[PDB]
Amino acid sequence: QTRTYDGDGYKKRAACLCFRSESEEEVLLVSSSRHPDRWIVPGGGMEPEEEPSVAAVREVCEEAGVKGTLGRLVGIFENQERKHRTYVYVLIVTEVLEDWEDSVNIGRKREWFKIEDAIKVLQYHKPVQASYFET
Ligand SMILES: O=P(O)(O)O[C@@H]1[C@@H](OP(=O)(O)OP(=O)(O)O)[C@H](OP(=O)(O)O)[C@@H](OP(=O)(O)O)[C@H](O)[C@H]1OP(=O)(O)O
Ligand SMILES: [Cl-]
Ligand SMILES: [Cl-]
Ligand SMILES: [F-]
Ligand SMILES: [Mg+2]
Ligand SMILES: [Mg+2]
Ligand SMILES: [Mg+2]
C-alpha cells in the first residue's frame, strides 16, 4: 500500500486500456471510488521497485477483475492538478473474473464502452484519462 513518487514529487501510477478484443473498439471502465455514478480508467499506484507494466496489470486485476494479454505502452500522462504521472498500457482482455477484489470490498462496477462513449463519460472529471484514447 506504500505510494511511490518520481523525483519531482508526482505520484507514480500505472493503468490499462482494457479492450474487449484486438480490434480495440470497446474498453472496460470502472466506477469512481469517490463518486460511484462516474466512470474512470482502472489504475493505481506503483509499489516500490515495481515495473510499470506489472503495476498496470495488477491494478486492473484488483479494480476491474480482468486479466489478458499485455500490449504496447501508449504513453506517460501527467495530471498537473493532482500531481501524478501514469504509464498507460493496452491490455487485450482474455479473462473476466467474478467477485473480484474491488467488487467484494467497495461494490466497484465495470462496464464496456465504445471508445467514443468512454471519452464522453471521462471528459468532465477525468479529462487526462479521456486523452489516453486520443492516439
Ligand atoms: O480509489 P481509486 O483507486 O479508484 O482512485 C483514487 C486514487 O487512487 P489511485 O488509483 O491513484 O491509487 P490506488 O489506490 O493504488 O488504485 C486516489 O489517489 P491517492 O490520493 O494517492 O489515494 C485519488 O485521491 P486524491 O489523492 O484526492 O487524488 C482518488 O481521487 C481516486 O479516486 P477515483 O478516481 O474517484 O476512483
Ligand atoms: Cl474491442
Ligand atoms: Cl487523471
Ligand atoms: F490500489
Ligand atoms: Mg487500486
Ligand atoms: Mg486506483
Ligand atoms: Mg493500489
Numbering used by the authors: 8 to 142
The study reports:
We have biochemically and structurally characterized a minimalist inositol phosphate kinase (i.e., TvIPK) encoded by Terrestrivirus, a nucleocytoplasmic large (“giant”) DNA virus (NCLDV). We show that TvIPK can synthesize inositol pyrophosphates from a range of scyllo- and myo-IPs, both in vitro and when expressed in yeast cells. We find a heart-shaped ligand binding pocket comprising an array of positively charged and flexible side chains, underlying the observed substrate diversity. A crucial arginine residue in a conserved “G-loop” orients the γ-phosphate of ATP to allow substrate pyrophosphorylation.
